[PDB]
Design a protein around this ligand. Structure first.
Ligand code: HEM
Length: 154
């Protein structure tokens, strides 16, 4: 698939807002993922022990990881589809070290859309959400194709 320039503009316009507070958005998103799909928490040996949202909010370690996740995703989005090289080392770690099924990448995609919709309603109307959704679908498809080349396709 290919996003048009106007689609990339809607994505990067809301992303610019997100970047005013990377740590707070990172936290909101991981917590939304873990609350909505608790099975995903099981993949993190680092956070497996957290029992409530309160504990999650208080974890500086979780917040640090949120920053890491959104910084990597932001570097990919800013490539506007030219992300081949950037994708490769994360596809390999997520496929053979962490073992993350594509299903779970769909789950964090939903969490991202939820949080942006809640925090940026004026910049995240139907057209901007449609563009972000296509950008995340592009990302998942390319990561799925890499998974296949690497032997996981899990
Ligand atoms: C937008 C999707 C995602 C991005 C951009 C992302 C990015 C990253 C980055 C940059 C790291 C650190 C370096 C590395 O190990 O590659 C990481 C580690 C990790 N990711 Fe992801 N990730 C994503 C989705 C997920 C999902 C959905 C899960 C699991 C449900 C997951 C599980 C992990 C685990 C287990 C680690 C290692 C945590 C530790 O430090 O112990 N990731 N991720």
């Amino acid at each position: 698939m290919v996003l048009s320039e106007g689609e990339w503009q809607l994505v990067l316009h809301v992303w610019a807002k997100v970047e005013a507070d990377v740590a707070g958005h990172g936290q909101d998103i991981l917590i939304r993922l873990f609350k909505s799909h608790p099975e995903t928490l099981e993949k993190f040996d680092r956070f497996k022990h957290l029992k409530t949202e309160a504990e999650m909010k208080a974890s500086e370690d979780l917040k640090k990881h949120g920053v890491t996740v959104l910084t990597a995703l932001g570097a990919i989005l800013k490539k506007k589809g030219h992300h081949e090289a950037e994708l490769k080392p994360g596809a390999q770690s997520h496929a053979t070290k962490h073992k993350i099924p594509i299903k779970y990448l769909e789950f964090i995609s939903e969490a991202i859309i939820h949080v942006l919709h809640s925090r940026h309603p004026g910049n995240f109307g139907a057209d901007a959400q449609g563009a972000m959704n296509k950008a995340l679908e592009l990302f998942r498809k390319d990561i799925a194709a890499k998974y296949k080349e690497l032997g996981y396709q899990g």
